[PDB]
Amino acid sequence: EAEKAADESERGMKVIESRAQKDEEKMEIQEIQLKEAKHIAEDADRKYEEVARKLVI
């Protein structure tokens, strides 16, 4: 019984290992995506200020 339980516990441990690795991958991908998002936001902000200036004039 103990040896079978050991096999199953290692099974579960390895499954959680793999899932955590996949999650880290998705985390870094979303991280680079978020940086790109921030840059797009700043660009839009600058464009907005510019067009406001033009309209006032």
Partner: protein
């Protein structure tokens, strides 16, 4: 010519924080500090500083004329500090109006160019491309045949 030059020669830590932040943005170590004027303006707008493209384009037309794209630390720091508003509010409007009425002898509701030339030659400064007609080019906005105190401000407001 010398004000920002003196400030850089006495490089302060408050400006140095942003300077070195943009430096690590630009220079990753053991570099010549190239930092092209186009890239310099890109980062200047990028890192949350003043997003004024006019100074950046002035640099681009002015800097990297060497053809190497590198920008020396002297002029890069000068344009960085002068991109920020470095002026003591240009004295007082009423005080400057009194200064100009001392300057303006005609008191004809304005001041003519020749009085400005007299005061300029009284100052005793060197002449360069921004002389002779640069004042004429800038001040001739509506071309009223004069350089009023208001027109003189329109030309070179914030006189310090």
């Amino acid at each position: 010519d010398d004000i920002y030059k003196a400030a850089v020669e006495q490089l302060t830590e408050e400006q140095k924080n942003e300077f070195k932040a943009a430096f690590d943005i630009f220079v990753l170590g053991a570099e010549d500090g190239c930092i092209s004027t186009k890239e310099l303006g890109k980062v200047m707008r990028m890192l949350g500083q003043n997003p004024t493209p006019e100074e950046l384009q002035e640099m681009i037309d002015e800097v990297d004329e060497d053809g190497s794209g590198t920008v020396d630390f002297d002029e890069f720091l000068v344009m960085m500090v002068r991109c920020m508003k470095d002026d003591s509010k240009g004295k007082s409007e009423e005080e400057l109006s009194d200064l100009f009425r001392m300057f303006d002898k005609n008191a004809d509701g304005y001041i003519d160019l020749d009085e400005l030339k007299m005061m300029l030659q009284a100052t005793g400064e060197t002449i360069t491309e921004d002389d002779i007609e640069e004042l004429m080019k800038d001040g001739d906005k509506n071309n009223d045949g004069r350089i009023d105190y208001d027109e003189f401000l329109e030309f070179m407001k914030g006189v310090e």
